[model samples]
Target chain A: MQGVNIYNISAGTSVDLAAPVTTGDIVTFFSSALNLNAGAGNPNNTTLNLFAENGAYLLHIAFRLQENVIIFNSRQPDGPWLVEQRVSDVANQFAGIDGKAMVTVFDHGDKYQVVINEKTVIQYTKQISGLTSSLSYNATEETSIFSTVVEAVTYTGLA
Target chain B: MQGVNIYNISAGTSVDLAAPVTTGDIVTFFSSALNLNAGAGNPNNTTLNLFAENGAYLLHIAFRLQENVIIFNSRQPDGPWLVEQRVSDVANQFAGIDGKAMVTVFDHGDKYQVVINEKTVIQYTKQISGLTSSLSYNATEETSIFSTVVEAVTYTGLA
Candidate 1:
């Protein structure tokens, strides 16, 4: 692992369990960040919110204004996201405008144990925990009825 | 490693290396597939396309694509991609339209790395590799998109 800058970003936030890591713990972040228009109200014009409860879980809530795709990689409990891929357009099978997708990723080491709202899309095996990134709607103008976002959420758990 | 399918899509094709890898190299594949339309004969769309050269490297490649991000766990590489993670439509800076982004994966395990695109963007990582649910793109789609994919090459001194 030479020449690599692999900084473990999961040091401070870790969940303690008798067996090292267990299930049902959340991994979330602070509700808001500093910087941007005004204070930290998570403007009603496109936003992201996070919550880490009981210390044993992870939840992602999204609020959309148009059509776009966002990708992220996370190893729960205490791992940073490794990749964030994205795309935007309302064509093909993707909803033209009003569409929403919420995802929750839980890990058991051998499989991610995932749930996508109403569908059970994927079950990953490797315990996730390297990096994390995000994507959200950003519109500066309120236009003639243009597009503005509302809010979103991501909750992590710990036990 | 029972049900895992480690493919060598890098047989003989053209690629654009964003980051270089070596055998025994185990960089994590954060995103595996994406939608890249290379027209009817304008090839090189597969994930890893090897070429017929002195070291059998990739050709005509892109690291990130729509909703796809992957990591490369290298080995002089008879090594399989140790991990791969993905997320959908979370990197859009603007709702669902007019926004496209990628994950910035910084690995120190590569032979030599390059980012033909931008790094400020590709910033996402996951701590787990989905086992049962993760999949590989079709060969015609996974193997070299080069009309004629050559598995064996005339390479030397690599790894």
Candidate 2:
């Protein structure tokens, strides 16, 4: 709490939320188009994706590459991420990777809340059998990757 | 990093550091008299302990029950807790289950650093070959258990 720089994780490629995943835990980071690469488009026209271990459940704020609109959602382990919440965009939320967007996930006991910038995008309560997981972030090489120059993943565990 | 409360892992229980244990990651939390329990005494006379998946490699900050000192250590899968640092007063720090303190482990590429309440307690750069592991916290039940209300663990990932 004093001398040392107690805040900040090294910024780089990807981060593993290897800590106990539970209520009151939070994962946060900032992003922009600079991190998104020119890779193969996210399999299903998706932009960025994030999840915990086992990938049992995941959250995706896919910017439909061709549709010109943003699709926000949460889904089961694998295919068919069918629960659609918004078929719109948050003004200039993900307008450009260089604009710098913020992302956060809060484990609130029975639910997981995701916030992008200051807007609450998804309040997922779906259960994952082995949901006791860690924190992690992923972006489409062709869409968006994490940019640490902006913010390193800061994970908060329950004391 | 804003509006969210930053705190810790429960003292008595073991918490998973959900991230992939690699080089350059940082793990941190805060402590106080509130999390320590009234157990027989920190089983084996220990206040706060950290470890990887296996019991072999571990880190500990033992507060000798009767002594006026603290033991900073690292251990292998089994026996032998090799010492590296020490501090005065097993009293003030663990004075109560409510007295608050800060703890941190910073992965500095080839080494690791342990800080207690702003003081550098241990710079454990000793390599534990094949230390690829996860994050977890453990404490004795007789006197202390971690209280999430203190602060959640903040894990930093690579860019």
Q: Retained native contacts per candidate, as fractions? A: 0.00, 0.17
Instruction: Give the number of the best model, judged by TM-score.
Output: 2
Here, model 2's chain A TM-score works out at 0.59
Off by over 4 Å in 2: A1-159, B1-11, B32-47, B90-98, B127-132, B140-142, B145-152
Expressed as tens digits, the lDDT of each residue in B1-159 for candidate 2 is: 213222235544554544434454445565444433333443334445556667645556565544446666677877676755667754454442235555666655556666664456656665453343444445554444344333444443332
TM-score, model 2 to reference: 0.42
lDDT tens digits, residue span B87-107, model 1: 233223212222121121222
* Cα lDDT listed for each candidate: 0.26, 0.49
lDDT at A76, model 2: 71
Per-residue alpha-carbon lDDT of model 1 for A88-155, expressed as tens digits?
22122122212333233443334444333323334544333321233223323431011232222222
CAPRI-wise, candidate 1 is incorrect
TM-score, candidate 1, is 0.20
For model 1, the superposed segments whose C-alpha errors exceed 4 Å read A1-35, A38-159, B1-38, B46-159
Interface RMSD of each: 15.8, 8.6
